[PDB]
Amino acid sequence: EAPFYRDTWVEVDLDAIYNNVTHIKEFIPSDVEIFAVVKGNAYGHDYVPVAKIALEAGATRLAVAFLDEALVLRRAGITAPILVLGPSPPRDINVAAENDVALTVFQKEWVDEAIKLWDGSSTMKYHINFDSGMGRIGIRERKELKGFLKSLEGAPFLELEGVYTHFATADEVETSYFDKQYNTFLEQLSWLKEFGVDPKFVHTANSAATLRFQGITFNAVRIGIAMYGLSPSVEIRPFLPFKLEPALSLHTKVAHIKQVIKGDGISYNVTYRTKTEEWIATVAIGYADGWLRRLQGFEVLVNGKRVPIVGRVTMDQFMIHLPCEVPLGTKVTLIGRQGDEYISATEVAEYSGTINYEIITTISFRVPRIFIRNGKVVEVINYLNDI
Amino acid sequence: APFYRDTWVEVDLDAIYNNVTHIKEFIPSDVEIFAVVKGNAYGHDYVPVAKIALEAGATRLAVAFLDEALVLRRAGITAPILVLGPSPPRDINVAAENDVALTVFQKEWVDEAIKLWDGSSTMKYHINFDSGMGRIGIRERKELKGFLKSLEGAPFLELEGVYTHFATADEVETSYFDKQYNTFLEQLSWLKEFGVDPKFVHTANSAATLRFQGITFNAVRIGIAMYGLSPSVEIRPFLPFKLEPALSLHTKVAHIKQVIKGDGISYNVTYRTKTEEWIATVAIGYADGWLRRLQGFEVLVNGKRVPIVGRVTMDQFMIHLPCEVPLGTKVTLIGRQGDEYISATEVAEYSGTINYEIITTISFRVPRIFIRNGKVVEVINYLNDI
Ligand SMILES: *Cc1c(COP(=O)(O)O)cnc(C)c1O
Ligand SMILES: *Cc1c(COP(=O)(O)O)cnc(C)c1O
Ligand SMILES: [Cl-]
Ligand SMILES: [Cl-]
Ligand SMILES: [Cl-]
Numbered sequence: 001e002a003p004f005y006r007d008t009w010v011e012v013d014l015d016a017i018y019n020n021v022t023h024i025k026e027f028i029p030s031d032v033e034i035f036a037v038v039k040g041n042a043y044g045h046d047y048v049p050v051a052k053i054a055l056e057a058g059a060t061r062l063a064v065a066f067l068d069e070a071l072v073l074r075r076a077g078i079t080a081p082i083l084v085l086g087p088s089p090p091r092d093i094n095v096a097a098e099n100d101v102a103l104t105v106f107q108k109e110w111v112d113e114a115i116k117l118w119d120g121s122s123t124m125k126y127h128i129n130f131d132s133g134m135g136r137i138g139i140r141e142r143k144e145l146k147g148f149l150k151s152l153e154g155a156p157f158l159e160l161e162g163v164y165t166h167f168a169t170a171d172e173v174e175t176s177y178f179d180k181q182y183n184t185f186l187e188q189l190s191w192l193k194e195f196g197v198d199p200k201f202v203h204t205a206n207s208a209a210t211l212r213f214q215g216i217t218f219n220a221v222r223i224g225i226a227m228y229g230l231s232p233s234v235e236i237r238p239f240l241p242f243k244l245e246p247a248l249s250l251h252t253k254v255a256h257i258k259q260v261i262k263g264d265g266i267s268y269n270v271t272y273r274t275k276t277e278e279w280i281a282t283v284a285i286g287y288a289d290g291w292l293r294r295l296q297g298f299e300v301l302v303n304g305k306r307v308p309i310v311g312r313v314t315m316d317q318f319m320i321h322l323p324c325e326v327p328l329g330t331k332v333t334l335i336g337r338q339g340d341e342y343i344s345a346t347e348v349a350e351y352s353g354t355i356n357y358e359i360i361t362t363i364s365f366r367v368p369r370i371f372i373r374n375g376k377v378v379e380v381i382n383y384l385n386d387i
Numbered sequence: 388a389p390f391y392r393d394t395w396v397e398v399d400l401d402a403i404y405n406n407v408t409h410i411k412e413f414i415p416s417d418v419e420i421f422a423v424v425k426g427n428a429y430g431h432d433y434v435p436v437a438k439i440a441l442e443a444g445a446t447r448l449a450v451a452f453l454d455e456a457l458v459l460r461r462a463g464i465t466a467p468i469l470v471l472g473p474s475p476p477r478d479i480n481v482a483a484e485n486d487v488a489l490t491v492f493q494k495e496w497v498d499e500a501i502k503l504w505d506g507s508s509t510m511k512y513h514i515n516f517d518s519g520m521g522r523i524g525i526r527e528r529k530e531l532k533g534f535l536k537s538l539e540g541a542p543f544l545e546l547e548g549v550y551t552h553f554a555t556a557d558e559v560e561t562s563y564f565d566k567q568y569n570t571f572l573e574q575l576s577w578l579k580e581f582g583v584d585p586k587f588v589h590t591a592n593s594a595a596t597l598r599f600q601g602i603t604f605n606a607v608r609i610g611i612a613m614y615g616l617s618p619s620v621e622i623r624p625f626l627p628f629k630l631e632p633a634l635s636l637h638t639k640v641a642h643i644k645q646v647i648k649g650d651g652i653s654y655n656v657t658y659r660t661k662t663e664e665w666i667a668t669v670a671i672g673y674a675d676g677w678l679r680r681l682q683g684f685e686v687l688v689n690g691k692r693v694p695i696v697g698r699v700t701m702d703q704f705m706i707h708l709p710c711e712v713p714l715g716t717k718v719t720l721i722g723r724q725g726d727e728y729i730s731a732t733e734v735a736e737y738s739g740t741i742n743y744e745i746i747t748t749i750s751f752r753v754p755r756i757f758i759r760n761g762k763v764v765e766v767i768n769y770l771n772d773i
C-alpha cells in the first residue's frame with residue numbers, strides 16, 4: 001500500500017475485471033484464447049494489477065501499445081506472452097527478443113533495417129498485422145505481402161507467432177463494413193497460403209466483435225474495454241449478451257466549503273457568478289489529472305445528489321455548487337456510484353464530446369490507484385512515489 | 388532513460404533558464420521567484436525544471452499537492468517548497484518531516500491537525516486569502532479570527548507567508564484585478580489588525596508579474612512564463628520581453644502507404660480518401676494526451692502542415708501527406724520544424740481550450756529529452772521508473 005497525500009483517487013475493483021474476463025472466457029469457444037489488452041496504462045486502471053488479475057481469470061496472453069509498456073510487465077515478474085500491437089522502430093529488435101516480447105511486424109523496410117541492427121543471435125517473435133479496412137497499420141496488398149516475405153528470407157531471426165487484423169466498425173449496429181473486413185481478411189489469409197506461410201495463430205476480434213459475431217474468434221480474441229466492464233459503444237450496449245461490471249471509479253473529497261454571496265465570481269475569468277448566496281465546495285482534482293476544462297457544467301455526485309461543476313476547472317482543483325453545507329472531507333464521486341445514482345465513464349464522455357476509452361485512459365499518472373479484491377484493499381499504487 | 392518508441396517531448400533547458408533570468412532581471416532585486424512546477428512542471432517534468440529554475444535564480448518551488456513536493460525532495464532538491472492546493476490534515480507530519488510548507492486557511496484543518504500531530508514535528512504554512520478567485524482561502528474577517536483562535540492550540544504550526552491569487556490577470560481590462568488587489572490589501576489590514584505580521588507576501592502569477600506595478604511584494608509565483616508561453620493571446624503584445632518556448636513534442640513516421648480512392652481510415656470510417664492518397668501513421672494517440680478532438684488539426688512533416696485524418700486512436704493517428712516520405716521521417720506536433728512552428732496555443736485554440744491544458748496533459752508514458760547548450764543532458768522515461 002503506497003502512501004498518498006491528496007484525497008483524490010481511482011478505485012479499481014479487481015473482482016469486476018476478474019468477472020468480466022471469466023464471463024468472456026465462458027462465452028467464447030473452449031479452444032479460443034484471450035489477450036488481455038493493457039495498453040494505455042491498462043486503460044487507466046494500471047498495467048500490472050490488471051494484467052495479473054486477467055491472467056488469474058483465464059486470459060493467457062497480454063497486449064500493449066509499444067515496447068516500454070511490455071517491459072513494465074516483464075519487470076513485474078509477468079512471464080505470459082506479450083504482443084506489441086502498435087508499430088515499433090527496428091532498433092527494438094534485440095531488446096524485444098531478450099525480453100520475450102513479440103512485435104507487430106508488417107513492412108519489408110522494417111525487416112531490411114532489422115537485419116542491419118540484429119545482434120546475430122537473438123530470435124524475435126512477430127505477428128503480421130493485415131489491414132483489412134482499419135487503415136492504421138498492417139499489410140493491405142498481395143504484392144506488398146510478397147515483398148515483405150522476400151525480405152524475411154534474409155532475416156531467419158524473425159519468427160512468425162501469429163497473424164491478425166482489427167475491425168473499424170464492430171461497435172456500429174449496421175454491419176456492412178464489418179462484413180467487408182471479414183471477407184477481405186480471408187482473402188489476405190489466402191495470400192499467405194499462396195506464398196507457403198502458415199499463419200499459425202490467428203486473431204481478429206476486439207471487445208465489440210467478440211461480444212457480437214459468430215465465426216470471428218479464430219484462435220484468440222483481444223479484449224480491452226469489455227475487460228474493464230464498459231460497452232465499446234452506446235449503440236451496442238443495449239444488446240450485449242451479458243452484464244459488464246465496471247471496474248474503475250474516481251473520487252475526491254470536499255477540500256473547502258464556503259457560502260459565497262449573491263453575484264460573486266468563481267474561478268478564472270469569472271465565468272460563473274452565484275445567483276443567490278450559494279454553498280460552493282472545492283475539490284483537489286483538475287485538468288492536470290485528466291479531468292478537463294470541457295467538464296465545466298457537468299454534474300458530479302455528493303451525498304448521492306447530482307451537483308454541477310461551476311467556474312473554470314483549474315489545473316489542480318475545481319468548484320461545485322451544493323444545495324446544502326456539507327462537512328470538509330465529504331466524498332465527491334466523479335465516476336462511480338453514490339446511493340442510487342451512478343455516473344458512468346460513458347456519461348462523462350458524452351458530456352465531453354468523446355468516448356469512454358478516452359476518459360478512463362487519460363486519468364493522470366499522478367492520481368493514485370487503490371485496488372480492491374473481495375471488497376478489501378489489497379494494493380495501492382502511487383506512481384509519483386516511483387519517479 | 389532508454390525508450391523504445393520514437394515519440395518524445397524535448398525540453399530546452401536554456402529556454403527555461405533564460406525566461407527565469409529575464410523575469411529576475413525585470414522584477415525588483417529584493418523580490419524572490421517561486422518556480423511553479425505543479426502538474427509535472429506543466430508537462431516538462433518536475434525535477435529538471437526545478438533544478439534549472441533554481442540555477443537561474445528562482446529561490447523557491449511551488450506544487451499542487453504534497454506528493455509532488457516529495458518527488459522533488461527525493462531528488463535532493465532542498466529549496467523551500469509550498470503546496471498551493473488544499474491538503475488533508477493527515478498530511479501534517481509528513482509535510483513537516485520533509486520540510487514542505489502547506490497552504491492552511493481553515494480552523495477545521497487546524498482542529499484536525501491537532502488530533503493527528505505526532506507530538507514533535509513543526510510544520511510551516513502559508514495563509515491563502517481568497518480575494519476573488521473563489522477557489523480556496525480565507526474570505527472574511529470573522530473567518531480569519533476563528534482561524535487565528537484555533538492556532539492557539541497548535542503551537543507546532545509556523546507561519547511562513549501569506550498570499551492570494553488573481554483570477555483575471557491575463558485579461559486586457561483590469562477592473563476585476565484592481566478589485567482583487569484592493570480586497571487583498573484589506574485582508575492584509577485585518578491580519579495586521581489582529582497583531583500578526585504576514586512575514587512574506589506573494590500574489591503575482593506570470594501575467595500579473597509581467598504587467599503590473601505594486602504587486603511584487605516579497606515574491607512572485609511563475610508558471611507559464613517560465614515555460615516560455617504567454618498566459619493569454621490578448622496580453623501577448625503587452626509583454627515586456629520575448630518569452631522562449633521550452634517544450635516541443637515529436638514523433639516519427641511509423642507507416643506510410645498509398646491508399647486507393649474511396650477507402651476508409653480509422654474507427655467508424657469517418658475519413659475516406661478522395662484519390663489515391665499517401666497516408667502516414669505515427670505512434671502517438673489519446674493515451675499520450677493527444678486527444679480525439681485534434682482530428683483535422685495540421686501537424687508538421689518535412690516543414691509542411693498536413694492534416695490528421697480519421698479518428699485519433701489510443702496510441703496512433705494518421706496523416707494525409709502530399710507525397711511519399713520514408714519511415715522515420717520526423718513529425719512535429721508542438722514546436723519548430725523547418726520553416727514552420729506550431730505553438731501550444733495553436734493546438735489549444737483548435738481544441739477549444741488553453742495552452743496550459745495542452746502541455747500539462749502530455750502523458751507520463753512519453754519520454755522527455757532535456758537539451759542544454761544544444762546537447763542532450765538527460766532523458767527521463769517515467770515508464771522505466773514504475
Ligand atoms: C485497442 C485495441 C484492441 C482492444 O479494443 P477494445 O475495443 O478495447 O476491445 C484490440 N486490438 C487492437 C489492435 C487494438 O488497438
Ligand atoms: C497555477 C498557479 C500559479 C502559476 O500561474 P501561471 O499563470 O502559470 O504563472 C501561481 N499561483 C497559484 C496559486 C497557482 O495556482
Ligand atoms: Cl490496426
Ligand atoms: Cl453473427
Ligand atoms: Cl487560490
Ligand SMILES: [Mg+2]
Ligand atoms: Mg464582497
Ligand SMILES: [Mg+2]
Binds near residue numbers: 330331
Ligand atoms: Mg458520506
Ligand SMILES: [Mg+2]
Binds near residue numbers: 373
Ligand atoms: Mg466480490
Ligand SMILES: [Mg+2]
Binds near residue numbers: 539
Ligand atoms: Mg495569541
